RNA sequence: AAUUAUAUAACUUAUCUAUUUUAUAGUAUAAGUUUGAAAUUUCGGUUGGGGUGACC
RNA sequence: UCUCCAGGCAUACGCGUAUAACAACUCGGAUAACCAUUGUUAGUUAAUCAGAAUAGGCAAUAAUCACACUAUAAAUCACCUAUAACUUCUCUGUUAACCCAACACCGGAAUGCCUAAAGGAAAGAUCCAAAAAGAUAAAAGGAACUCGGCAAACAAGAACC
RNA sequence: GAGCUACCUAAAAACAAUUUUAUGAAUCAACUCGUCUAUGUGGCAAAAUAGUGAGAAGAUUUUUAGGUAGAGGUGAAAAGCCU
């Protein structure tokens, strides 16, 4: 009798009724463990393909005018409503976004460096080794996956022939090609880390259930005897 | 018309009036008019409580008879 | 605890729970949750002129009953039809095609009243 | 108390009463008889008695066929015979040790395979067998169409037989349209397999759709009571005149 | 690019036709005859329905490109 | 605290456990009901 | 503890595919090898209370 | 009429005639009176209380007297474009001292209004024993009690492991 | 078999007065719980009564409907709860 929420086809920037699961399957038993509760919450579809050609429209590319910089249940990071022509979308803010600030949507790869200004979104070849990005994508075309938590950055180590190497936060190295789009600057809420949880009942508001009160080498044949 | 029910048995059905054809019924086609195979356990079943109930009567008469003419 | 046994109606259950106690519907439900009645689903009862008429609920002890004979199918149509036909055999105007003149119907479809299936009640 | 019939005898009881009855005479023959498939996942006996090596006496031997279990899905598909063994093992082979749940199951592949008398590519899940069968046969058509029931397995197998004899028996121009000699062709080297058009309607078909075949062929409307009385009546009345 | 709509909540994929269909010259027997369904026949096809007159309480309305006041050039209201 | 007491009756909750068209929705509830009519049952569900 | 262990997870050889000049890759299956989620079964006898040593 | 007590009236869920009158006095109420019992007859009335056409386009801006503010856990069809239809009141709930606890059970049982204008009766009659239970009062003393200030107190303060 | 109980999902509800650095703060009702004692021990009760106590804007309490089922479920682990 479990229907997923995630049932909404049509993109829109209006906010949308979350249900909770409370760590269970559409079986209906846990899979999860502490997961219940917390404050009911709206989700706002953010658009993690930053270089989205507006429809009926060239693929070149194109800027678009930050709105507002708001506060997002859904994530640690916090996203900015960006209109451009007659479209509105939410996407996720960089460390320095202000309302009102104007960001470049590119598909060009610059024969040579393009000089990287915090969230504008270019393609890996244009950008310079050494230059901070977030929300990177695995493959062209595939959308963000990677680099979209509060206060993440990859570096960009290399670049030969048509491949480049992403040192992702974790300190894993990635490659992938340089098609792929990546946005410059790290992401929004830098201090997320700093903060103090204080007391058991804010991570109940959180939609966190406390932990359960529950409180392996095999020697070889030589070794048995000396264990 | 004749059908079976999800019960096994045959009973006469009695058609209804609607305004869409039988095919484009939702409702209509929710209802089964067929029996699966765990049903012919209890077909069997029935076909024996059944035979006990007209032995017994059978039998029961012809004690009856007994005693009429031991009686005249 | 709950009564197995008796019948579900109405008056049991919350009352999002409702049913009906088996009167016809006499119209419809339309949407911004409006009654319209139909004035053609509301049974009309049709009552003849009683004036004059001689016969009254109760017969005479003297009246003799009648041999019982139930109507059947053929006693309907030689009162009916054999006449007509044997009529018109005689004269030799008669042919399958025209069964219709003799009061055959072919099909009940187009009838007000259809004899099958029943589309009037009693 | 007891039933008259032995339980075994039941279905052929009621094939003997009732629409089943009226059902054409070749068809229940299929039903009646039932005849043990070619042997897949068992070793016959070459001979009916061997020598027992420890008495050394001669000693009838049977064959014991292997149960096997069919899956609805083979239904859709050409298994050459092949099915599910559904058994036990010893582990390790020895008698002494744990006795253990196995299945082995059959290596499925699917194929294209092309019939010439439908003119039609069909793609069917399918065993490596089949395909040996195939080959034997010389020919997608002729494996079908020389198969028996039994050995056959599938109710898709034996529908697509009902298609090939239908098609021959009637010698359907349908079959390559505008080219007469090569439709011509492929009857003729299908010849030995033809049979009369009733016959080929009811190859293949499960008791449940013979039924409603011959339900649909007897199906009628009422004759209206008007009609048959007139008949009567206009007899009488021409005889009088005669 | 994410695809909203997640294929668990879609509308389900249509079952595959039965076999007896793909064979060419073949009349299937189904169970359209019974007027009801049964697991061991073949499913029937059938033709669009027409009621044959309109009626209002349920009206069916046709799609944006044949509605008459249909105009290329858009207009923003 | 006192036991004895652990039938709360809703209707809405005794149709939807043990109704009729609970009992027919599963083969293994049907085979309850064919249970019933061959015991003789008044009541075959709630 | 003894017996098992297509729960997973790996591998190897077949089988089946593609390619390949023999190589690669894969894999509706079969046979092995490694892990063990589990399963099944058992708690000999003499020894104040034990511990221990012993004994049959 | 008097004496005294202080959760009542509605709705929801549930219950299913326990409702009311008459007649009975077998059974039921743990006894009578009287009926909650038996038999017969009656009852609960609603257009406002309660239950029960289609296809497209589309949304950044809590609530808290919403103003000022602050905040964080980030918080509820409409409107528009077209298409179609072009006057309607039937059906169902409505009684009660009632439900879940084997019982006319010192138990369990949601919300709104109100705190006596509503709702009720702790004593069948008599007697004034022991033991047992509960309440109040205490000369002198004030933890000497007891495993322990348990319980009670005109006390309800302080401090340390 | 989850109308009890354990946990969860959806939709709802309740929180007076008094102080406060403005809150899993304080005092204390309604409400929730069940510390200690006496009574009761076939009891009013198959866990209650009477006092005395703990929390009482929150990890609070409560209502309606749904969900997870025994080789299992749930568990702020008592091997506790699942009529
Ligand atoms: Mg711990
Ligand atoms: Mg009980
Ligand atoms: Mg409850
Ligand atoms: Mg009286
Ligand atoms: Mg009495
Ligand atoms: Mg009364
Ligand atoms: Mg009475
Ligand atoms: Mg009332
Ligand atoms: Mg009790
Ligand atoms: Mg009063
Ligand atoms: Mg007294
Ligand atoms: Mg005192
Ligand atoms: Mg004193
Ligand atoms: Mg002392
Ligand atoms: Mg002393
Ligand atoms: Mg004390
Ligand atoms: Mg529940
Ligand atoms: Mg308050
Ligand atoms: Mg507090
Ligand atoms: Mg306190
Ligand atoms: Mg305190
Ligand atoms: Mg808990
Ligand atoms: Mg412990
Ligand atoms: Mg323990």
Same mark, same amino acid.
């Given at each position: 009798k479990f229907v997923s929420w995630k049932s909404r086809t049509k993109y829109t920037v209006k906010p949308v009724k979350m249900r909770k699961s409370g760590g269970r399957d559409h079986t209906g038993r846990i899979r999860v463990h502490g997961i219940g509760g917390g404050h009911k919450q709206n989700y706002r579809m953010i658009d993690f393909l930053r270089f989205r050609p507006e429809k009926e429209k060239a693929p070149e590319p194109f800027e678009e005018k930050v709105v507002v910089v708001r506060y997002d249940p859904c994530r640690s990071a916090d996203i900015a409503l960006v209109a451009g022509g007659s479209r509105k979308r939410w996407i996720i803010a960089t460390e320095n976004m202000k309302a009102g600030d104007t960001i470049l949507n590119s598909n060009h790869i610059g024969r040579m460096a393009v000089a990287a200004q915090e969230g504008d979104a270019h393609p890996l070849g244009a950008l310079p080794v050494g230059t901070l990005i977030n929300n990177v994508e695995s493959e062209p075309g595939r959308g963000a996956q990677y680099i979209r938590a509060a206060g993440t950055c990859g570096v960009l180590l290399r670049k030969v022939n048509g491949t480049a190497i992403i040192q992702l936060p974790s300190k894993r190295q990635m490659q992938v090609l340089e098609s792929c789009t990546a946005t410059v600057g790290?992401?929004?809420?830098?201090?997320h880390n700093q903060r103090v949880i204080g007391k058991a009942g804010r991570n109940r508001w959180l939609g966190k259930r406390p932990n359960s009160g529950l409180w392996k080498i095999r020697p070889l044949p030589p070794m048995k005897s000396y264990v | 018309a004749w059908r079976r029910d999800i019960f096994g048995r045959i009973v006469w059905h009695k058609f209804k009036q609607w305004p869409i054809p039988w095919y484009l019924n939702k409702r209509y086609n929710r209802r089964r008019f067929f029996a699966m195979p765990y049903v012919d356990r209890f077909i069997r079943l029935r076909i024996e409580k059944h035979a006990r109930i007209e032995a017994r009567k059978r039998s029961l008469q012809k004690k009856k008879e007994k005693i009429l003419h031991a009686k005249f | 605890?709950?009564?197995?046994?008796?019948?579900?109606?109405?008056?049991?259950?919350?009352?999002?729970?409702?049913?009906?106690?088996?009167?016809?519907?006499?119209?419809?439900?339309?949407?911004?949750?409006?009654?319209?009645?139909?004035?053609?689903?509301?049974?009309?009862?049709?009552?003849?002129?009683?004036?004059?008429?001689?016969?009254?609920?109760?017969?005479?002890?003297?009246?003799?009953a009648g041999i019982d004979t139930p109507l059947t199918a053929?006693?309907?149509?030689?009162?009916?039809?054999?006449?007509?036909?044997?009529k018109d055999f005689k004269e030799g105007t008669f042919d399958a095609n025209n069964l219709e003149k003799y009061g055959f119907e072919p099909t009940?479809?187009?009838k007000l009243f259809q004899l099958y299936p029943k589309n009037f009640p009693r | 108390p007891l039933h008259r019939y032995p339980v075994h005898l039941w279905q052929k009881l009621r094939l003997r009463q009732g629409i089943c009855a009226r059902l054409?005479?070749?068809?229940? =023959?299929?039903?009646?008889?039932? =005849?043990?498939?070619?042997?897949?996942?068992?070793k016959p006996h070459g001979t009916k008695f061997k020598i027992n090596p420890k008495n050394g006496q001669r000693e009838r031997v049977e064959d014991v066929p292997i149960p096997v279990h069919y899956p609805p899905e083979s239904q859709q598909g050409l298994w050459g015979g092949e099915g599910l063994i559904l058994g036990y093992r010893y582990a390790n082979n020895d008698k002494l040790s744990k006795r253990v749940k196995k299945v082995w199951k059959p290596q499925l592949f699917t194929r294209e395979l092309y019939s010439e008398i439908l003119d039609k590519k069909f793609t069917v899940t399918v065993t490596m067998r089949t395909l040996?069968?195939?080959?034997?046969?010389?020919?997608?058509?002729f494996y079908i169409l020389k198969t028996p029931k039994e050995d056959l397995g599938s109710k898709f197998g034996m529908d697509l037989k009902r298609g090939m004899l239908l098609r021959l028996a009637r010698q359907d121009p349908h079959l390559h349209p505008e080219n007469p000699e090569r439709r011509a062709a492929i009857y003729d080297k299908y010849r030995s397999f033809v049979i009369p058009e009733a016959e080929a309607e009811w190859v293949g078909l499960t008791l449940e759709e013979a039924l409603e075949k011959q339900r649909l062929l007897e199906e009628k409307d009422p004759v209206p009571l008007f009609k048959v009385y007139v008949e009567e009546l206009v007899q009488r009345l021409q005889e009088q005149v005669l | 690019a994410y695809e909203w709509g997640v294929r668990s909540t879609r509308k389900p994929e249509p079952r595959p036709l039965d076999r007896v269909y793909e064979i060419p010259g073949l009349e299937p027997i189904t169970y359209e005859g019974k007027k009801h369904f049964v697991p061991w026949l073949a499913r029937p096809i059938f033709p669009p329905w027409e009621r044959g007159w309109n009626d209002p309480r349920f009206?069916?309305?046709?799609?944006?490109?044949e509605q008459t006041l249909y105009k290329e050039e858009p207009c923003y209201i | 605290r006192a036991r004895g007491n652990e039938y709360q009756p809703s209707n809405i909750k005794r149709k939807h456990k043990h109704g009729w068209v609970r009992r027919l929705s599963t083969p293994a509830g049907v085979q309850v009901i064919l249970r019933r009519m061959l015991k003789g049952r008044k009541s075959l569900s709630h």
């Open positions: 790290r992401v929004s809420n830098v201090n | - | 605890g709950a009564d197995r046994m008796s019948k579900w109606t109405s008056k049991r259950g919350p009352r999002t729970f409702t049913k009906s106690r088996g009167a016809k519907k006499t119209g419809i439900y339309t949407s911004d949750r409006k009654f319209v009645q139909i004035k053609e689903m509301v049974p009309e009862f049709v009552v003849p002129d009683l004036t004059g008429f001689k016969l009254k609920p109760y017969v005479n002890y003297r009246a003799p053929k006693a309907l149509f030689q009162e009916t039809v054999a006449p007509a036909i044997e009940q479809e187009g | 054409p005479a070749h068809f229940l =023959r299929s039903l009646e008889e039932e =005849r043990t498939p070619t042997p897949v996942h068992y040996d069968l195939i080959d034997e046969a010389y020919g997608f058509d | 009206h069916r309305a046709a799609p944006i490109h | -």
